Design a protein around this ligand. Structure first.
Ligand SMILES: CO[C@H]1O[C@H](CO)[C@@H](O)[C@H](O)[C@H]1O
Ligand SMILES: CO[C@H]1O[C@H](CO)[C@@H](O)[C@H](O)[C@H]1O
Ligand SMILES: O=N[O-]
Ligand SMILES: O=N[O-]
Lengths: 409, 211, 213, 213, 211, 402
């Protein structure tokens, strides 16, 4: 379990030992991270089904239960990043996955009983936001296991199939409803399995602006992930959104991967910049798909425009990461050259810096999984329309086009 | 290459006593040190890896510690089994062995029990004659054996051999064989094997007459 | 049960080649490097190098660059050390041990003695040694004029293993001589027989010798 | 010419026996008696008795009747002291000296240190001490946790004999500790090397430690 | 048994001065008295037999006299070599030694030259840490040594050792060593060794910090 | 050379070193003593040959030179016994042996010069008598080296072989006179020097009137007849060269001294001394009836009777002191050991005086033979004074002891 001699930058070690151990750790890592994305977004599919089983909460109170996980999620991302060098990859993974069985059983009971207070439901949602932090600890872990010049692929895999968890849950939670307990309890066998699997299979080794640009991209993917099924119910109450909502966050994740791959083919800042034009254009065209009370509008268009807003948000996530990655490689190149060192040192140090920075950048970035569905709450509960919220979004994506041109291209 | 020096090169220590072997590397080895035990004829056993982690099976009495260049290893409650040569090794950059530490246990002084044997008649046919003397179960190792033929001392043609210390009772045994031509052997009548030990100022004398 | 079992002792003349083997079992072979350690008579342990079992790349210590080759046979799950153009200096016992990395050399082979000599191989002369009076008598066995090592010697084929002292062989004029004592109580001899069994593989000899009053 | 040379130090446990010896040369052994003198640590000289070298007859002072034996071996030209059933109280340096009568005790042996103790014999740890004022620097050597005495320490094998102070061992919790210091000119260190050599006979240790900056 | 009292049992006397030791026997020993010198570690030398007869080689500065029960011994022009313990002995009936006279030489007061030494890293691996102070070549013998750890004083763990007066320059040297655990040592920063001698009212101080 | 710790009564000391040192001292003391006797009785063999080389001295002027050694001999014995404790055994034995080279050279020269005065030949004989006192000092020295119970055999050995010096000379000096008279004197200068060096390196320095008269009658006779016999057996039988036979006299005398004590401690000190004076009267008379074989055998018996007498007078003295100290000690109430040791000390301290009186007869006997032969033409004059004396001595033995 404990590993005292770890030398990934040494090809000879990599070939005898490293690759085998890092590869087994990676493969057990992924399930434990996508399951944390499943548990993170429970209310994105459960708050929709809350009234349909006898819960008289404001639709704003429902958006609130959808927004709160990302409160604790964002705030637990910085401390979780410091937890891997302290307890170790095997132990923390086991622990941080295992303790997700708490809020999963607890809203399997609370949902069946009809007199259960809002107070309890706020707590369960905040404890679901613990699953949100798994990302930063899982991502530090992987950065330790893989050699600096190979971390890209593994990190890409870890968070790529990690983010996929949101989409995977949305495809399952409605399909398992045959009622509202099963959308929570179907994960207790899976969380347990891979806690045991992590416990035995894994190993214990011995710029503010970028936070904003990540926030605008990832924050959007994860924001629209929280309150889309919820929004496409206060707009088109007669369509069964649950059977379609999954496809959104699915495209988002796939877009994240093509994000960086695209970006190193035609410029980090360029893609970011052009894709904030798209994220603005698609924020405006949503205005022209809304029905006003009620109800005269288009759904296919609404859904396609949102499908675009998930694709565009994913693309940006990848785009922003490789901008960070690139910025750090320029900084480290210049410093080393001034110290008079080798490019290898610069490569390694840039890989460490982006990994050290990642805990903080992903913390700020996760704050947008709250604001977005909170804005859809305080737009509805006030003006009785989503037009108020979306007006803020449009201004922001305009601000992000501005703040990218001015500060980069 | 990273050089390793080990202290002490050898030592004798009481049962229930404590040993401290030290190892100084020529540069930093970042905790990558292992300790081996080597009984003679058998093959080395790994006691400790990574400065201070006991191999499983290896008993509590063993431990090590250190960092950078300077490391040490200790056996805390010495036992007769512990008799061996110990080794530090660095496995930081390439690998390097230390020079060894031949550990001897001390025990209550003991006199050799001695017995002499005349040439077998089977050997006599060859034209050679060996008189053989066994001095068993003595401590400590140092012992002188003198050969007398009819009072006169014999110095040429003697050949001596010693066991490794016994890992049960901590004793030694040595084997002295005096080799002559059958002629030489047949000429004289009395052969004497004299063991002079630390345990008495007067030698243990074993002998035989050819009749 | 993890084990590495090595080829038996070899005697060669200056100029020739040996090749020693090491069969690993009890663990997945290609997951661990293999080390080779040299021990010349009365010297300490020398690290020769290692071989990478997942790629077959050898790595040699400054001193073992030239006449030494490590090689592998993954399916046989065994490694080999080949020594070429042998010099007297290659006389040593050679170990294989497993792992460069976490628990470096955490299992060893039993060792393999290589003698580099020109001396002719000859069988031993095994002389019984009988006494010429406590409650216990000591009998002996003289084993003279053989080359090379090892001879092995037991008493009543192993049955009489306590009371025994076999003395390390001593070489002289290109011929080893060895000996061994047993002491037993007087009740047991000559009443029951005590016999000296001497194997000398190098010359394909097995001699027994009953100790006669 | 005339000289008596005694045997070396001995450690023993309560209940055990010791025999010290004394070799006389450069005179005719049987012409002079042999005296035995005790010196317990800190106390003064005590006469035990003498042995008549033409008789072999011993004479014991009051306090040495019982457990003490002087014997002689005229041909080895040597006499012996033999204490038995040893007690803590027998810890002393023991002296043989020549002559009861004319010039009583006119030549002495170099003395022999018997320690009676149950303490275990342990080897010393030897620590180099390098500086942290004038044209001359002082170096040191710390020698910790050994039993029994004597350790013996030199500098550059006895080549550095001036500037040396060696401080008497002090016993604490069954373990002696000792130290030594040398002052040399700044022109000669670290320029030339200065190294400390410790020998602890009762455990067959010899350790050298080179003083490094 | 004839008892001997010796006087004085110790004394310091100037270079060039005159020493008188006296010895009284409990009965008439009829001129049978010997005087021995005993430098430490070496073995006694016989100076005088039969009260007044110098042994051959022994310098003129030595002599003795007496009769019946009363005897005396004198060194007339004291030299620094003469540092030792002196002994009368009666070899009349049996033999009896006197109690000794340890003789010290006086000299111009000398101040200690002081050296402090931090723990060796080789020692640090064991888990013990000794700070060593050497105060060399001072006179007179009496001296106090205080250990400060970060201004705070330390008494527990100090061990002190002094040499025999030096037979060439008549000086003393002492060694003080303070032993802590590697932990206790690692916590604090500055280590201080204060020598307080009868050569000045303000102490000689030596120190270091662990950096 | 100097011994500060001497303890012969201590068997331990004796065994460790006493016996070794006392033995070496005895073996060098002895030859030194016989050589002193040789020098002492020199003129007993030289004065006879004085005319044969051309010296006009009266046969009584010759008898005088044979008598005068015992004058200075006797008078120097008492001060010589005080010499050892003052100067030490090694110093005195060296010196007192060495200085005997003076007379042994002087009369080696004086004998070749035919016209050397009688005055010079007197001086030399008085110096020859210095050698006579050696016995007193040598004997006291020995008494100091040996425990007061082993002293007998050592003193017996020292004095016995000492007394054999006269006998040795009279065998040698005639025989050496061939290869003339210088050799009777000069053959002793190598020997005296050899043993002065031998003592000086080999030896060590430590830190009743009636009895005198009886020793005078015994030893004074031996030493009297030793000097006078040749010088008389000339004026009586000038046809026979006596010097080829004379030695056998003192030889039988000295050897009779050894058995004298051994006889006496078996059948009484006073008895033997009594019955021996009967024979020293009978033989003193049966000499009148020979004035050669018979003259020689009666005189050969007069040496023999002078021997036993000396050895019997010693053990008589020894017993006298041993009886006295016994009684004194028992009155004090101490131990027999004290009594033994004190007796041995008393007889040894008295010896320096008893042997001085006894030495005066080596002067009288030949001087009497001188005056008797010068006044009358016979030896019968003095020889009558002898018979009377031994009767007066056999009468003083009975009356005072028997
Ligand atoms: C402060 O940033 C917040 O508001 C903007 C709109 O202004 C959202 O797009 C974003 O998700 C949210 O985090
Ligand atoms: C006074 O005595 C002297 O006279 C007698 C003879 O009368 C001698 O026998 C004796 O030796 C002599 O000394
Ligand atoms: O979960 N990505 O920040
Ligand atoms: O020389 N005897 O008295």
């Amino acid at each position: 379990a404990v590993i005292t001699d770890w030398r990934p930058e040494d090809p000879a070690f990599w070939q005898q030992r490293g690759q085998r151990i890092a590869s087994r750790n990676l493969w057990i890592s992924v399930p434990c991270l996508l399951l944390a994305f499943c548990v993170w977004m429970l209310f994105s599919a459960v708050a929709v089904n809350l009234p349909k089983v006898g819960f008289n909460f404001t639709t704003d109170q429902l958006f609130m239960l959808t927004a709160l996980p990302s409160v604790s999620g964002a705030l637990l991302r910085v401390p979780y990043s410091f937890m891997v060098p302290i307890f170790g990859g095997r132990r923390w993974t086991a622990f941080s996955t295992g303790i997700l069985i708490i809020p999963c059983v607890w809203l399997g009971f609370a949902v069946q009983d009809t007199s259960t207070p809002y107070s309890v439901f706020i707590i369960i949602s905040l404890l679901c936001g613990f699953a949100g932090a798994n990302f930063a600890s899982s991502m530090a872990n992987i950065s330790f296991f893989f050699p600096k010049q190979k971390q890209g692929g593994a990190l890409g895999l870890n968070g790529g199939l990690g983010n996929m968890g949101v989409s995977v849950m949305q495809l399952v939670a409605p399909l398992v409803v045959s009622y509202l307990a099963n959308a929570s309890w179907i994960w207790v066998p899976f969380l347990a399995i891979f806690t045991i699997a992590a416990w035995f299979g894994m190993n214990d080794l011995a710029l503010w602006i970028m936070s904003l640009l990540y926030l605008a991209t990832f924050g959007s993917f994860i924001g629209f992930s929280a309150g889309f099924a919820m929004l496409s119910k206060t707009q088109f109450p007669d369509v069964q959104i649950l059977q379609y909502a999954f496809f959104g966050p699915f495209i988002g994740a796939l877009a994240r991967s093509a994000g960086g791959a695209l970006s190193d083919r035609l410029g980090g800042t360029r893609v970011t910049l052009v894709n904030f034009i798209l994220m603005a254009i698609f924020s405006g065209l949503l205005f022209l798909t809304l029905p006003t009370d009620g109800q005269g509008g288009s759904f296919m268009a609404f859904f396609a425009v949102f499908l675009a807003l998930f694709l565009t948000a994913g693309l940006g996530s990848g785009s922003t990461f490789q901008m960070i990655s690139v910025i750090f490689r320029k900084l480290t190149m210049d410093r080393v050259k001034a110290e008079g060192g080798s490019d290898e040192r610069a490569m390694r140090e840039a890989a460490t810096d982006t990994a050290a920075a990642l805990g903080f950048i992903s913390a700020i970035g996760a704050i947008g999984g709250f604001f977005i569905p909170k804005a859809f709450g305080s737009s509805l509960a006030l003006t009785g329309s989503p037009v108020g919220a979306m007006k803020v979004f449009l201004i922001f994506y305009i601000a992000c086009v501005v703040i990218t041109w001015a500060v980069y291209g | 290459d990273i050089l390793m020096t080990q202290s002490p090169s050898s030592l004798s220590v009481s049962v229930g006593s404590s040993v401290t072997i030290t190892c100084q590397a020529s540069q930093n080895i970042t905790n990558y040190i292992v300790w081996y035990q080597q009984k003679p004829g058998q093959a080395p056993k790994l006691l400790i890896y990574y400065t201070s982690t006991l191999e499983s099976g290896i008993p509590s009495r063993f431990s090590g510690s250190g960092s950078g260049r300077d490391y040490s290893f200790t056996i805390s409650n010495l036992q007769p089994e512990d008799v061996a040569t110990y080794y530090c090794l660095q496995y930081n950059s390439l690998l390097t062995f230390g020079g060894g530490t031949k550990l001897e246990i001390k025990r209550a002084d003991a006199a050799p029990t001695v017995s002499i044997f005349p040439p077998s008649s089977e050997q006599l046919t060859s034209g050679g004659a060996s008189v053989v003397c066994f001095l068993n179960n003595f401590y400590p190792k140092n012992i002188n054996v003198k050969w007398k033929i009819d009072g006169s001392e014999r110095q040429n043609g003697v050949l001596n051999s010693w066991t490794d210390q016994d890992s049960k009772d901590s004793t030694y045994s040595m084997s002295s064989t005096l080799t002559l031509t059958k002629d030489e052997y047949e000429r004289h009548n009395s052969y004497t094997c004299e063991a002079t030990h630390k345990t008495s100022t007067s030698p243990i004398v074993k002998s035989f007459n050819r009749n | 049960q993890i084990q590495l079992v090595q080829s038996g002792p070899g005697l060669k003349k200056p100029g020739q080649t040996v090749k020693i083997s090491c069969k690993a079992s009890g663990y997945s072979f290609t997951d661990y490097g293999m080390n080779w350690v040299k021990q010349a008579p009365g010297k300490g342990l020398e690290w020769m190098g290692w071989i990478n079992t997942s790629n077959g790349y050898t790595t040699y210590g400054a001193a073992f660059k030239g006449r030494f080759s490590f090689s592998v046979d993954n399916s046989a799950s065994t490694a080999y050390l080949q020594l070429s153009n042998l010099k007297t200096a290659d006389t040593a016992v050679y170990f294989c041990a497993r792992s460069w990395y976490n628990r470096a050399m955490d299992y060893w082979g039993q060792g393999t003695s290589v003698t580099v000599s020109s001396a002719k191989t000859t069988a031993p002369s095994v002389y019984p040694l009988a006494p010429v009076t406590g409650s216990s008598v000591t009998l002996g066995c003289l084993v003279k004029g053989y080359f090379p090592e090892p001879v092995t010697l037991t008493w009543n084929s192993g049955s009489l293993s306590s009371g025994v002292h076999t003395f390390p062989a001593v070489l002289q004029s290109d011929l080893y001589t060895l000996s061994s004592s047993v002491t037993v109580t007087s009740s047991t001899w000559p009443s029951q027989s005590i016999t000296c069994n001497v194997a000398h593989p190098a010359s394909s000899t097995k001699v027994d010798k009953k100790i006669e009053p």
